[PDB]
Curated annotation (Swiss-Prot):
Localisation per UniProt entry: Cytoplasm, Cytoplasmic ribonucleoprotein granule; Cytoplasm
Annotated protein name in UniProt: Zygote arrest protein 1
Stated family: Belongs to the ZAR1 family.
Gene encoding the protein: ZAR1
GO biological process: membraneless organelle assembly; mRNA stabilization; negative regulation of translation; oocyte maturation; translation
Gene Ontology molecular function: any one: zinc ion binding
Keyword Ubl conjugation carried by entry: yes
Length: 98
């Protein structure tokens, strides 16, 4: 099995393109802030870790570090996930948020 990963919230900045983005699908080594998968800048297509990681506040139970199966709804038109810029799912048929 791959090590368990912990979905967290990340803040990113590509200084070369001066593009900031955020993501609710930052995959961390569980229990840590170590980021296991890169995300890619939409303009220069280089790989980045976020400069800041935060625990997700669960929208099911309102806690951090909870055991709920889903903390943030999937398939969310108001909160898209760029599959093509995600180190975890850019090569897969189903995105992280599918
Ligand atoms: Zn860039
Ligand atoms: Zn929860
Ligand atoms: Zn993904």
């Amino acid at each position: 099995h791959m090590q368990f990963l912990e979905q967290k919230y990340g803040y990113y900045h590509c200084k070369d393109c001066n593009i900031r983005w955020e993501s609710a699908y930052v995959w961390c080594v569980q229990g840590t802030n170590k980021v296991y998968f890169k995300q890619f800048c939409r303009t220069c297509q280089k790989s980045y870790n976020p400069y800041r990681v935060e625990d997700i506040t669960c929208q099911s139970c309102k806690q951090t570090r909870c055991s709920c199966p889903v903390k943030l709804r999937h398939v969310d038109p108001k909160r898209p996930h760029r599959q093509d810029l995600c180190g975890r799912c850019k090569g897969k048929r189903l995105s992280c948020d599918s």
